[PDB]
Amino acid sequence: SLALSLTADQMVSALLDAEPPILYSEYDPTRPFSEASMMGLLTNLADRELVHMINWAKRVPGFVDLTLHDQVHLLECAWLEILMIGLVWRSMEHPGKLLFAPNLLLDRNQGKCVEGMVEIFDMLLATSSRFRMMNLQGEEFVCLKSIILLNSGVYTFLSSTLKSLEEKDHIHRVLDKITDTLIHLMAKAGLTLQQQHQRLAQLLLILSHIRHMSNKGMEHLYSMKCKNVVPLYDLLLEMLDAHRL
């Protein structure tokens, strides 16, 4: 079940088919929200999404080839990035609001309910605005999401002879394949060569902002943790701790 053999169309197909479902938040929640209130809803949804994310990762071409320790590291480093790009993606057709869930559509004003959270909401909205301006496509989105998984912690990985060096070139080869896929999709859309490279760069630069939001969000979450405002969701907490060691 090699991934280096997959064709561009096959790659997209696999990714699209591996897509996780869109989860619902607690129904008919009490409004207006309180800090501990919004925090609970958001982290509860995240904790449940993480379970699906882990199982989605196993479906990302080449991911299963890596060692468990390597799979663990990649996900621990990229989980919030992956949650955020999915969020931004769902909010695309909803200017001004973040679609955390079909029954949880929030705007920047609701972000003020949690201290320091409005800053994060604004960055998320700006990114969604950016996706809209570019008219980001689903095929491109699933490609970008897989890139985040494979790339975010690819260097944070320790070197150890051809050993670790093996679980590195393989990742880079796959990453290269996703690049070919992206270019393939753009070419099929009739984009000129110059337009293809320009769009490819535009899409990848987005990942820089996504990493930035994850860093800020992580710091913020760890902040809410100490303030004892985050419910006890083990998986979520575990992953958050990974960003402390």
């Binding site: 379970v51 199982n55 468990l68 663990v72 996900l75 083990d234 998986l235 575990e238």
Partner: peptide, 11 residues
């Protein structure tokens, strides 16, 4: 890295 480990292990 316990729960993630196990959940990733789950066959």
């Amino acid at each position: 890295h316990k729960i993630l480990h196990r959940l990733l292990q789950d066959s």
